[PDB]
């Protein structure tokens, strides 16, 4: 996934019930006060949820497209690894809703978000 | 802003009533299927809103911290420039709420989001 490469996002788990991925906080990922740019977490949340959603749909099949990403920012950090896990809230014919929670290396939540996706049909 | 440099985000307007910025969609900003990673728009929305919010607060003053970013994805594109504008929804003592709308080079909306920020006090 191109943008994931820029983030340094690396997946550790991926399947129909969820996904997990991680990245190292680096200086290029910060904002002006030297803490993580919120966009990084929004992006992490989007990636992890979308990959889980695709895995589930294809476990008739098809593709997925994001329609809403709603992220709450909890705690400001400046370095170390962050870790996200996606868990399912709704998985149906038309849409899916996934929760992604990002923690730091002290198991404190730094961000948490929900991603709503549309399922798109495949050619039969 | 370090992460804005990674995005290629360049501001054109910044003041108390809003901000505007723009980036070129490049291959590094794409996801699996060759369209813009939703995270990019999330991040754009976060940056433009936060800078508008900081400008308004300092027009006692202080700093700002994001607490929620809620972005709707509207249209998938693969190239060209995108342009965001922040408009104010609420600006008060404790919090701000900003709307950011992202358009492409045909003036179609590609993403739209609202960012909720906390105002943080300064040393008097
Ligand atoms: Cl994996
Ligand atoms: Cl639908
Ligand atoms: Cl400017
Ligand atoms: Cl508050």
UniProtKB/Swiss-Prot annotation, chains A, B:
Transmembrane segments: none annotated. GO terms for cellular component: cytosol. It holds the Pfam family 4HBT. Disulfide bonds: none annotated. The keyword Hydrolase applies. Its EC number is 3.1.2.-. The keyword Hydrolase applies. Keywords: Hydrolase. Belongs to the thioesterase PaaI family. NCBIfam families: unchar_dom_1 (TIGR00369). This is Putative esterase MT1895.
């Amino acid at each position: 996934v191109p943008f994931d490469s820029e983030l340094g996002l690396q997946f550790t788990e991926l399947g129909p019930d969820g996904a997990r991925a991680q990245l190292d906080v680096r200086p290029k990922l910060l904002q002006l006060t030297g803490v993580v740019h919120g966009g990084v977490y929004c992006a992490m949340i989007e990636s992890i949820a979308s990959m889980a959603a695709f895995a589930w749909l294809n476990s008739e099949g098809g593709s997925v497209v994001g329609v809403n990403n709603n992220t709450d920012f909890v705690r400001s950090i400046s370095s170390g690894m962050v870790y996200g896990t996606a868990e399912p809230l709704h998985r149906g014919r038309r849409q899916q809703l996934w929760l992604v929670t990002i923690t730091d290396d002290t198991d404190r939540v730094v961000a948490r978000g929900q991603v709503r996706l549309q399922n798109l049909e495949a050619r039969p």
